[PDB]
Design a protein around this ligand. Structure first.
Ligand SMILES: N[C@@H](CCC(=O)N[C@@H](CS)C(=O)NCC(=O)O)C(=O)O
Length: 215
């Protein structure tokens, strides 16, 4: 507003699944953001400069010309509506939109949740492997496989934000040698979607390399 617009500042760490979800969304929208690395491993998110941007000290965070937003999936739907050029990535139709939203909550409350509850303690807290938490991943993947039965995408007939959200989680599971082979709809979708996602190699795999690096 009455201001020279600048690129969106994107506070992120390449390996982070929720940051990759946002990065893939920007790529799909043909948005060039200003990538600002926040090194969580030496506490850059806890410095006064970042706490002023986000008092919750989480990434991803965007600063869109003074508008500060965090929660990856809220960023995704903001960018899609504010900068979208088609009506397929986040449909305006309320029922189609609701299914996309449902799948984003499923990702955050079930799939990504189960992934993190199991792997993060084992890796970065030297925790003992908990079989029940491991099995919660399979439970979530079983539901994802059901959602994909007879479907090409996770939330409708075209690629949507929900595919970008969920692929950031599923590709991290693959990177950690989780056996996805029994979920045949998931593996079909996964092989199918990667060539369709703009900048998948640059924005997802290159970061996943940094992820396997640090683990
Ligand atoms: N629900 C949040 C999760 C964000 C999150 O957990 N970010 C982690 C990195 S993957 C973080 O910034 N941890 C540092 C902290 O919370 O202090 C989202 O989807 O954006």
């Amino acid at each position: 507003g009455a201001e020279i617009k600048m690129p969106i500042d994107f506070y992120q760490l390449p390996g982070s699944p929720p940051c990759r979800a946002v990065a893939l969304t920007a790529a799909a929208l043909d948005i060039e953001m200003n990538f600002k690395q926040v090194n969580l491993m030496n506490g850059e998110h806890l410095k006064p400069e970042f706490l002023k941007i986000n008092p919750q000290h989480t990434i991803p965070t965007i600063d869109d010309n003074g508008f500060r937003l965090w929660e990856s999936r809220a960023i995704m739907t903001y960018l899609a509506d504010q900068y979208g050029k088609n009506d397929t990535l986040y449909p305006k139709d309320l029922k189609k939109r609701a299914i996309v939203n449902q799948r984003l909550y499923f990702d955050m409350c079930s799939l990504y949740k189960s992934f993190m509850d199991y792997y993060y303690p084992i890796i970065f807290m030297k925790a003992v492997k908990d079989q029940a938490k491991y099995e919660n991943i399979g439970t979530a993947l079983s539901f994802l496989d059901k959602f994909l039965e007879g479907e090409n995408y996770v939330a409708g007939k075209n690629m949507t934000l929900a595919d970008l959200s969920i692929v950031s989680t599923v590709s991290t599971l693959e990177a950690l040698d989780y056996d996805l082979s029994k979920y045949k709809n998931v593996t079909r979708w996964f092989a199918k979607i990667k060539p369709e996602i703009p900048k998948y190699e640059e924005y997802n795999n290159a970061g996943l390399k940094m992820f396997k690096e640090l683990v």
